[PDB]
Short mmCIF file of C-alpha atoms in Angstrom, two decimals:
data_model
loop_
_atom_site.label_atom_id
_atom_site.label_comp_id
_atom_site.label_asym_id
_atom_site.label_seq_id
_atom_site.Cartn_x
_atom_site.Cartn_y
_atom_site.Cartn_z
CA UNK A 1 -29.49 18.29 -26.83
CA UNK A 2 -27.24 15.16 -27.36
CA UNK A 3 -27.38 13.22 -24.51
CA UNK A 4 -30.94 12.65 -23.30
CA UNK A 5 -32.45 14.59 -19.96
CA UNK A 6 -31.72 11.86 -17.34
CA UNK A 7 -28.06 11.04 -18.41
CA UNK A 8 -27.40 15.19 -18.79
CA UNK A 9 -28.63 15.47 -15.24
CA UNK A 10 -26.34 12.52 -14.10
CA UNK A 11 -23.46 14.03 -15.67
CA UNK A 12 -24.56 17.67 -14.47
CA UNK A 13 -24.56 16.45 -10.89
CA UNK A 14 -21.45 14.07 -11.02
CA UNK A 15 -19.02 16.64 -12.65
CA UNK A 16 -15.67 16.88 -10.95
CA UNK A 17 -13.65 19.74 -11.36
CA UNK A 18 -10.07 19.93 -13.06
CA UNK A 19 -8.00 22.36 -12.96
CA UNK A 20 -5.79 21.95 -16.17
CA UNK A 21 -8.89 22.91 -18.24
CA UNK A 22 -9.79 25.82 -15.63
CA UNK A 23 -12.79 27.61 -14.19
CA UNK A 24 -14.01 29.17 -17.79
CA UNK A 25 -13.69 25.57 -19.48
CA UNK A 26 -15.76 23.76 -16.43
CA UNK A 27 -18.30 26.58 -16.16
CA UNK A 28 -19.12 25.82 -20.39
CA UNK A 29 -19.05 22.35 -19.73
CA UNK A 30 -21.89 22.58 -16.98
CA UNK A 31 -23.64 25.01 -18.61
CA UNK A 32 -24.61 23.05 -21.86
CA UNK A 33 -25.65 20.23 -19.16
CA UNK A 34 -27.57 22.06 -17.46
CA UNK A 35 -29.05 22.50 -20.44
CA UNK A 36 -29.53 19.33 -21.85
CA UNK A 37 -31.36 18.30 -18.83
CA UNK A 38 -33.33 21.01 -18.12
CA UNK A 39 -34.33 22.33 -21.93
CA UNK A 40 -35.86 25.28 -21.39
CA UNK A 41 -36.47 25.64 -25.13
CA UNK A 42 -39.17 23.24 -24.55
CA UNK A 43 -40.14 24.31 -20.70
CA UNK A 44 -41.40 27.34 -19.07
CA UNK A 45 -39.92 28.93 -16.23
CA UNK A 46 -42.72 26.79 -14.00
CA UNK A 47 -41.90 23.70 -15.24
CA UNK A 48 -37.69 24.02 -14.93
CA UNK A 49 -38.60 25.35 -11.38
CA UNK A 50 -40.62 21.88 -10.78
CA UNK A 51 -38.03 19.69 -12.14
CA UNK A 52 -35.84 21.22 -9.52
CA UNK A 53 -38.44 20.91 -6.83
CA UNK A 54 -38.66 17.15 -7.86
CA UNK A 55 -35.06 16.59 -7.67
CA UNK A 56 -34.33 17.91 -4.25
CA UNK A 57 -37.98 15.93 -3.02
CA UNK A 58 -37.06 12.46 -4.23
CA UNK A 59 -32.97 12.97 -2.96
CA UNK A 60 -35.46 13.08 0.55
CA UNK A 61 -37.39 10.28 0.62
CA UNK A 62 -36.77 7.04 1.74
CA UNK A 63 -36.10 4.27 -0.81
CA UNK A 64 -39.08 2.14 0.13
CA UNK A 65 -41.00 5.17 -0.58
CA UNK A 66 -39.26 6.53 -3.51
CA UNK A 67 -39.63 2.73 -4.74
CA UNK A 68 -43.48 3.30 -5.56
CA UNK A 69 -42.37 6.26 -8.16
CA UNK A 70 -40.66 3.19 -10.28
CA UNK A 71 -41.22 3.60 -13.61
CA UNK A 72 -43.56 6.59 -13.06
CA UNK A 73 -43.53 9.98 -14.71
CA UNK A 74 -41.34 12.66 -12.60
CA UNK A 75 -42.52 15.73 -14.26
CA UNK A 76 -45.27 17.27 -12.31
CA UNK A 77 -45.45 17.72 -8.17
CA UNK A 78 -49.02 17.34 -7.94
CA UNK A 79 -48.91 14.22 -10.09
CA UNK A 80 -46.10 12.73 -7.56
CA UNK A 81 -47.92 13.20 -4.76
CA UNK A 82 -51.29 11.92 -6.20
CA UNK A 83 -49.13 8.99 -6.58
CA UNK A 84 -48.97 8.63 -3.31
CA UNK A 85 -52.19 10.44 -1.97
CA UNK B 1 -40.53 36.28 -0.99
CA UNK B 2 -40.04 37.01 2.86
CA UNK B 3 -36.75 34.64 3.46
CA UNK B 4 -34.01 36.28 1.38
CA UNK B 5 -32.72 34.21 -1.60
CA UNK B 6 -29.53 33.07 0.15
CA UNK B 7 -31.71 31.54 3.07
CA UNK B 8 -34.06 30.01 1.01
CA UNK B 9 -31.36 28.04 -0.95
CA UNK B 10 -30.11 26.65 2.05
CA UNK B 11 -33.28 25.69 3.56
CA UNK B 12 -34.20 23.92 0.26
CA UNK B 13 -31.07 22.02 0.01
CA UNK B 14 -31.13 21.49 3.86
CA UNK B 15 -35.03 19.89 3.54
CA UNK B 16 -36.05 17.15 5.88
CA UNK B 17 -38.68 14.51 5.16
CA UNK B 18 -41.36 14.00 7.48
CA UNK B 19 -43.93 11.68 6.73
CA UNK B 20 -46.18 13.18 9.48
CA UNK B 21 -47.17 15.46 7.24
CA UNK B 22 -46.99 13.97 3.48
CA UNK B 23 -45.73 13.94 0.09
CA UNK B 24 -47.83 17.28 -1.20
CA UNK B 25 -46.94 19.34 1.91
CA UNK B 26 -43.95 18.58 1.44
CA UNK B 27 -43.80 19.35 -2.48
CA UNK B 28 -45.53 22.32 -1.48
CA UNK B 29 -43.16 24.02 0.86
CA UNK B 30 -40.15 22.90 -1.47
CA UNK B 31 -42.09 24.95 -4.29
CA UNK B 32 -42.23 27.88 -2.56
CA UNK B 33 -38.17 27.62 -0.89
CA UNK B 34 -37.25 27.50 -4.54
CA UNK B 35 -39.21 30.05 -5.39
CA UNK B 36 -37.70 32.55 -2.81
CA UNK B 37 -34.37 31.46 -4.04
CA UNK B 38 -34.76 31.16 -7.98
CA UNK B 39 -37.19 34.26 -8.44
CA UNK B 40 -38.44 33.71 -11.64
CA UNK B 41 -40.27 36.93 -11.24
CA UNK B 42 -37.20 38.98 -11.24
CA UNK B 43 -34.78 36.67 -13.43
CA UNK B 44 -35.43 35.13 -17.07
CA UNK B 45 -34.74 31.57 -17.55
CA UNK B 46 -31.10 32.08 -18.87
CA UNK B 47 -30.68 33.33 -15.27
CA UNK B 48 -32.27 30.79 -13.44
CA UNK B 49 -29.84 28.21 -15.04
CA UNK B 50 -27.07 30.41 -14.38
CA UNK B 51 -27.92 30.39 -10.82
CA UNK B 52 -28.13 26.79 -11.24
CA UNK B 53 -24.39 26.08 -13.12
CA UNK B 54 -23.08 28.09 -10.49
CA UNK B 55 -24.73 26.45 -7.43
CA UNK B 56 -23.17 23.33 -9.29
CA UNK B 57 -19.72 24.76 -10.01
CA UNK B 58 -18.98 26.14 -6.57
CA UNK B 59 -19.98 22.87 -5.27
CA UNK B 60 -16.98 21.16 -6.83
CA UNK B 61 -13.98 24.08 -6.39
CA UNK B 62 -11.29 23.56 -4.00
CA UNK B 63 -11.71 25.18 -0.35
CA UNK B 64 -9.10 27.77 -1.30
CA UNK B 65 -10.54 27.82 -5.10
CA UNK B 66 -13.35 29.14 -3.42
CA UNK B 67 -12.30 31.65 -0.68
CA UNK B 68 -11.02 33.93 -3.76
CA UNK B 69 -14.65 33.81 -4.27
CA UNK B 70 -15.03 35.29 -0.57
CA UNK B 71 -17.41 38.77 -0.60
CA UNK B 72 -18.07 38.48 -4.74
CA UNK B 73 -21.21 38.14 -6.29
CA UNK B 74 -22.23 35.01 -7.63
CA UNK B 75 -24.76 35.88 -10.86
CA UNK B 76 -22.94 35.41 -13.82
CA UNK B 77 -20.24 32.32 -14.85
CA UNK B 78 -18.71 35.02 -17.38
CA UNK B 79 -18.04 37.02 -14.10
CA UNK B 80 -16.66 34.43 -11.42
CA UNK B 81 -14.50 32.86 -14.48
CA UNK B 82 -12.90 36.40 -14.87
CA UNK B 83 -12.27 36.44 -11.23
CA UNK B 84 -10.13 33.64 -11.79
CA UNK B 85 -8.96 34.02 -15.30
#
């Protein structure tokens, strides 16, 4: 979409509800977010599923260790973890 | 899979670290939790990110936002919205 993958996700995550635009308008809102983050135009059903994976593994690790991913790819499990043996 | 989807979400989102066992068996049971909960066997991808909006969505609502939600099913944003207007 628009906004690129990591900012979508951001946004995705940080949304705060409101309710003078209502349940309908929020639900739209997340939906193209979800999205632009997670383009499954361009991934399979595997790969969203990984991205997920990856999210809720790196929100677990501590930062010293999560540190060592600086800069790296975050698309692939077994290439995280070969990252790190 | 053997926990039923509800569990499985929970014990993904509820995952613990523990570097007494590593990075890839880690990554490895957090594949298979979201895989319990996300069945991409049963559901296409415009499900999957349903599932995901939602998971999202009710995340943010108000306590008593959300206990009108009490005892509905939780599948479809077009649905819960409609529950609500």
């Amino acid at each position: 979409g628009r906004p690129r993958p990591e900012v979508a996700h951001q946004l995705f995550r940080c949304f705060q509800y409101q309710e003078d635009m209502g349940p309908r308008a929020s639900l739209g809102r997340l939906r193209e977010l979800c999205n632009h983050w997670l383009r499954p135009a361009l991934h399979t059903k595997k790969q969203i599923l990984e991205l997920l994976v990856l999210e809720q593994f790196l929100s677990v690790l501590p930062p010293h260790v999560l540190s060592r991913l600086h800069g790296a790819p975050l698309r692939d499990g077994e290439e995280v973890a070969q990252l790190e043996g």
